[PDB]
Amino acid sequence: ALTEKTDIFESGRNGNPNKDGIKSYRIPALLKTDKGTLIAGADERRLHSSDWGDIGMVIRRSEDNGKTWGDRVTITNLRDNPKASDPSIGSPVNIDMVLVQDPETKRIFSIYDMFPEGKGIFGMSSQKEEAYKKIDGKTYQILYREGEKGAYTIRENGTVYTPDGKATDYRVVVDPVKPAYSDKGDLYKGDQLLGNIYFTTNKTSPFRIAKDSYLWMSYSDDDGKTWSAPQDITPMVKADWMKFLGVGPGTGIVLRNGPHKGRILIPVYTTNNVSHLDGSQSSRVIYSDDHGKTWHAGEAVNDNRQVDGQKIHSSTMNNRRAQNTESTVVQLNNGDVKLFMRGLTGDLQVATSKDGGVTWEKDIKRYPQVKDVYVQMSAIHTMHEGKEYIILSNAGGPKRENGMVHLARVEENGELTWLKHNPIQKGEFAYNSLQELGNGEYGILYEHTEKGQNAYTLSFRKFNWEFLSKN
Amino acid sequence: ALTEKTDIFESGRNGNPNKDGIKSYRIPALLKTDKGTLIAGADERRLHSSDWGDIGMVIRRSEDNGKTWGDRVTITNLRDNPKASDPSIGSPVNIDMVLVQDPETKRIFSIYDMFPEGKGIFGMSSQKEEAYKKIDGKTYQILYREGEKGAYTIRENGTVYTPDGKATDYRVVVDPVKPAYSDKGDLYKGDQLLGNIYFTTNKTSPFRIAKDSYLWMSYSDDDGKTWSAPQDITPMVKADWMKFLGVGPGTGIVLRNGPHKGRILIPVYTTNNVSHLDGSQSSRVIYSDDHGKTWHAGEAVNDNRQVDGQKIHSSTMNNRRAQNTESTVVQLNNGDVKLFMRGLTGDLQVATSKDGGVTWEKDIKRYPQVKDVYVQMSAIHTMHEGKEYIILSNAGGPKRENGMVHLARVEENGELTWLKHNPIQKGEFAYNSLQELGNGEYGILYEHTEKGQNAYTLSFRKFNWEFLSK
Numbered sequence: 001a002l003t004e005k006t007d008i009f010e011s012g013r014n015g016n017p018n019k020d021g022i023k024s025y026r027i028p029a030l031l032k033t034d035k036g037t038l039i040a041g042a043d044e045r046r047l048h049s050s051d052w053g054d055i056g057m058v059i060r061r062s063e064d065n066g067k068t069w070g071d072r073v074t075i076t077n078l079r080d081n082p083k084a085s086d087p088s089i090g091s092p093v094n095i096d097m098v099l100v101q102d103p104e105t106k107r108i109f110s111i112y113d114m115f116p117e118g119k120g121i122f123g124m125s126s127q128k129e130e131a132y133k134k135i136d137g138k139t140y141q142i143l144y145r146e147g148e149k150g151a152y153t154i155r156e157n158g159t160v161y162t163p164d165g166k167a168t169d170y171r172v173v174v175d176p177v178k179p180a181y182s183d184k185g186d187l188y189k190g191d192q193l194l195g196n197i198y199f200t201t202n203k204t205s206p207f208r209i210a211k212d213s214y215l216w217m218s219y220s221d222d223d224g225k226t227w228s229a230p231q232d233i234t235p236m237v238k239a240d241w242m243k244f245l246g247v248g249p250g251t252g253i254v255l256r257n258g259p260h261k262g263r264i265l266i267p268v269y270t271t272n273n274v275s276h277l278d279g280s281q282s283s284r285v286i287y288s289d290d291h292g293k294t295w296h297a298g299e300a301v302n303d304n305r306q307v308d309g310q311k312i313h314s315s316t317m318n319n320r321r322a323q324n325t326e327s328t329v330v331q332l333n334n335g336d337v338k339l340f341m342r343g344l345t346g347d348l349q350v351a352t353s354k355d356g357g358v359t360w361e362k363d364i365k366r367y368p369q370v371k372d373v374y375v376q377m378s379a380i381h382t383m384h385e386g387k388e389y390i391i392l393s394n395a396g397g398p399k400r401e402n403g404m405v406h407l408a409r410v411e412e413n414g415e416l417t418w419l420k421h422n423p424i425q426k427g428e429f430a431y432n433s434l435q436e437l438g439n440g441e442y443g444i445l446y447e448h449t450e451k452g453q454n455a456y457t458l459s460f461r462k463f464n465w466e467f468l469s470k471n
Numbered sequence: 472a473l474t475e476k477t478d479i480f481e482s483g484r485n486g487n488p489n490k491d492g493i494k495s496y497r498i499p500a501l502l503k504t505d506k507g508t509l510i511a512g513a514d515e516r517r518l519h520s521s522d523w524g525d526i527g528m529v530i531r532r533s534e535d536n537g538k539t540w541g542d543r544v545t546i547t548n549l550r551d552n553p554k555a556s557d558p559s560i561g562s563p564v565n566i567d568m569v570l571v572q573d574p575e576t577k578r579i580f581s582i583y584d585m586f587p588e589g590k591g592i593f594g595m596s597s598q599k600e601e602a603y604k605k606i607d608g609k610t611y612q613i614l615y616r617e618g619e620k621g622a623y624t625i626r627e628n629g630t631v632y633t634p635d636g637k638a639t640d641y642r643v644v645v646d647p648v649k650p651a652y653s654d655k656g657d658l659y660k661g662d663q664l665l666g667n668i669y670f671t672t673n674k675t676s677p678f679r680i681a682k683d684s685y686l687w688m689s690y691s692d693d694d695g696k697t698w699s700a701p702q703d704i705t706p707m708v709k710a711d712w713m714k715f716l717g718v719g720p721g722t723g724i725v726l727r728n729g730p731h732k733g734r735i736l737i738p739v740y741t742t743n744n745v746s747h748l749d750g751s752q753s754s755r756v757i758y759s760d761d762h763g764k765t766w767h768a769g770e771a772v773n774d775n776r777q778v779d780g781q782k783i784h785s786s787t788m789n790n791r792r793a794q795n796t797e798s799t800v801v802q803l804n805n806g807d808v809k810l811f812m813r814g815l816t817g818d819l820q821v822a823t824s825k826d827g828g829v830t831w832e833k834d835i836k837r838y839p840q841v842k843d844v845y846v847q848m849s850a851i852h853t854m855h856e857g858k859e860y861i862i863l864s865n866a867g868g869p870k871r872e873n874g875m876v877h878l879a880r881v882e883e884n885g886e887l888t889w890l891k892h893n894p895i896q897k898g899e900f901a902y903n904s905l906q907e908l909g910n911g912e913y914g915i916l917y918e919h920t921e922k923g924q925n926a927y928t929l930s931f932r933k934f935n936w937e938f939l940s941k
């Protein structure tokens with residue numbers, strides 16, 4: 001009814017690197033593809049377990065429904081700053097992925113955060129730096145030069161232009177070719193490599209991008225064996241007021257019914273400049289209506305939301321309990337979209353959209369039957385014996401421990417009745433990602449430690465309806 | 472050398488309205504048009520002198536270089552909320568104008584602030600309310616309905632649509648036809664007038680716009696006799712992060728030389744959601760490269776500005792002395808644009824743009840030779856006997872009193888040499904607007920009170936080069 005765990009990404013022990021030189025794995029994502037393939041994604045956290053540093057976006061493929069797994073495939077790994085004083089924070093950062101496959105074109109997407117060198121979201125400045133500039137209808141990323149106020153631009157072929165629009169001898173590797181694309185951002189003057197635009201300290205080149213939070217996307221057209229170079233989708237979705245914008249990690253969905261069928265939905269969340277992490281974390285989705293070519297930001301669940309008699313907006317809010325952060329997204333048979341959002345109420349918070357994720361209904365439903373200890377969750381739509389269900393997994397608590405797989409029946413109004421709460425993993429348990437495997441079976445890739453393992457080891461289990469409906 | 476003052480807009484006395492029922496006039500703007508006409512614009516502040524209330528945008532015309540002035544022409548005056556608890560703050564607001572003429576099309580522009588019913592910039596909400604929505608490639612103004620979260624839209628012919636996109640029986644007067652366009656925003660259900668979308672309190676209709684700061688524009692193609700209906704240019708220039716966005720009042724310019732010759736520049740300034748009026752007031756300009764059809768926002772002077780070792784941005788700053796507010800804009804013969812900005816340093820602050828107002832150079836120059844007591848100023852380019860000068864007028868201090876007309880020589884390197892500091896008006900002196908009249912003559916329209924006059928009476932004077940070099 002519930003298989004034993006198979007380890008997919010194994011962290012080191014007792015604060016040490018593993019045999020591959022990796023201290024830590026985190027942030028699982030699991031995807032079943034059109035070919036029946038399982039794709040397991042993770043943060044490869046080389047130097048330590050914290051939310052920054054030298055981190056690669058990696059996947060593994062299984063062609064036998066989770067029995068055996070191939071080699072690690074690295075989607076993206078930016079090279080570290082070799083001259084940084086502190087290697088722990090000495091690398092441009094990728095962190096947190098969402099996986100999803102377009103069911104029509106089969107293109108598989110990995111969408112993830114990017115920061116230049118630093119402590120990621122924990123090192124973002126109080127002051128905004130413009131990251132892009134529109135010129136003659138074209139959007140270019142800005143470079144800043146030491147001692148100059150003006151905005152240089154990275155234009156066609158990675159050629160660097162002056163603030164007044166003159167071409168220079170400098171160029172940016174905007175079409176990386178090295179393994180893991182570790183050359184992306186490399187700054188050249190003609191033949192000579194001088195440094196990297198993603199470096200922030202002890203720089204050897206004169207140029208850096210704006211210190212900000214970024215969103216990147218890589219894709220695969222061959223069942224996840226090979227991946228495109230990173231695409232910077234930030235300017236398509238990030239508002240001027242947005243401070244942080246990152247994914248709510250795990251697995252996204254494609255709407256399968258209603259007038260927006262074919263729309264890809266990716267959970268995200270933002271902070272604003274008023275309260276940042278302290279009172280503005282706000283769930284929403286970005287979506288694509290053209291098979292991943294262009295992206296749009298939906299509205300926040302918190303936009304024009306009523307809280308204690310007064311309205312808030314995600315761009316201006318400062319309210320700790322009204323926050324909603326990482327989320328997981330589900331479409332019902334009636335066309336409604338449900339968003340299960342990590343929050344600070346201690347229990348499950350759910351938003352409902354009726355227009356395919358663009359806007360959200362006035363009331364955030366809370367379900368006290370399912371505990372939320374402030375940690376990522378995942379959820380999937382499912383059918384069984386003619387009825388509609390949602391399967392949701394997260395920590396049962398009180399800490400990030402005692403994993404649960406909860407089961408809800410989908411009622412007529414689109415409301416949820418919680419039926420079952422099944423423990424799946426004693427001990428530590430955190431981020432996780434669910435997928436239907438077919439033939440009444442289900443998959444889960446999740447964070448856990450035993451035997452002194454560094455946080456975390458990412459493990460895989462299978463289960464069926466006897467596990468979901470034990471009494 | 473300096474004429475006696477002629478009063479163009481006269482306030483009431485001792486807190487009373489004048490014979491027209493107007494307590495107060497404020498915010499002068501003065502324009503010499505292609506036909507030699509002087510256009511003098513003002514806030515007509517009926518109920519009081521405060522920065523809100525029932526305020527009409529009005530002008531007067533002079534065809535004899537300021538000797539005589541015609542009747543008042545009202546550009547725009549929105550109707551009050553008849554059910555407001557306090558009429559003092561009971562009206563949608565227009566406030567602060569900039570005048571400018573396109574020398575090629577001869578079209579005259581008036582650009583000014585708009586707020587729905589309330590205390591204007593001192594009455595903005597704490598939370599953002601989305602004002603616009605793009606639908607099928609079109610941008611529509613949003614309406615909010617009591618008890619509903621969703622965004623209604625005002626679409627074609629002013630027809631109101633639901634959040635889920637169905638037309639309703641409700642409509643907005645989007646083509647006002649009453650004098651002064653006082654019907655703009657009127658909300659109808661079929662034939663029945665129900666209220667106004669700009670009303671915020673004690674409403675009789677179900678709909679209102681977002682409580683926000685707006686930017687409107689009206690134009691005249693007949694030398695200022697008649698004016699178009701107000702055009703809402705806000706969504707062209709207002710970013711998502713901007714809280715307040717308004718004009719730096721007075722008279723804008725058209726670049727007369729360089730690669731951007733023909734560009735219209737309108738001084739504006741913003742606040743952000745971090746510190747608002749406390750530390751984020753940031754000067755910039757908006758510009759049009761197509762004779763006023765479309766507007767674009769240049770960058771703020773404060774964007775990527777170095778302050779105390781750290782860079783700031785107008786959207787995130789919280790720094791009182793680093794603020795810059797209402798400003799006046801001049802182009803030099805070398806093409807550089809100078810922006811003289813109201814501020815809190817006690818002295819004159821000047822920014823320089825080399826790309827026609829889009830971006831600003833690293834150092835804001837200060838001139839302690841010129842006092843700035845935190846009040847609007849005006850400045851104009853002028854040539855005299857082969858040389859380049861800038862004339863700048865403002866309060867000499869210590870309060871908004873002791874009006875001064877300063878004269879600077881523009882040196883070759885683009886630096887300014889202050890030669891003269893000429894008193895022009897003892898007693899109260901505040902906002903003012905300068906224009907070249909031709910033949911070594913100059914005009915100034917300015918705020919001043921005497922004899923118990925309410926703040927302010929807007930008066931006009933002429934002066935020449937014997938005055939500038941007294």
Ligand SMILES: CC(=O)N[C@H]1[C@H]([C@H](O)[C@H](O)CNNN)OC(C(=O)O)=C[C@@H]1O
Nearest residue numbers: 027051095096113120121246277325326
């Ligand atoms: C980009 C990033 O930093 N992602 C972090 C995420 C984030 O820091 C919080 O959502 C911020 N909110 N702080 N509570 O948190 C966690 C976490 O296990 O708790 C893991 C992610 O890798």
Ligand SMILES: CC(=O)N[C@H]1[C@H]([C@H](O)[C@H](O)CNNN)OC(C(=O)O)=C[C@@H]1O
Nearest residue numbers: 498522566567584591592717748796797
């Ligand atoms: C739209 C508006 O309110 N315009 C006001 C302007 C504004 O209030 C401040 O520049 C902002 N706050 N100033 N710190 O100030 C003044 C003033 O005489 O001082 C007159 C204008 O009519």
Ligand SMILES: [Cl-]
Nearest residue numbers: 195196204205
């Ligand atoms: Cl470098």
Ligand SMILES: [Cl-]
Nearest residue numbers: 666667675676
């Ligand atoms: Cl009303």
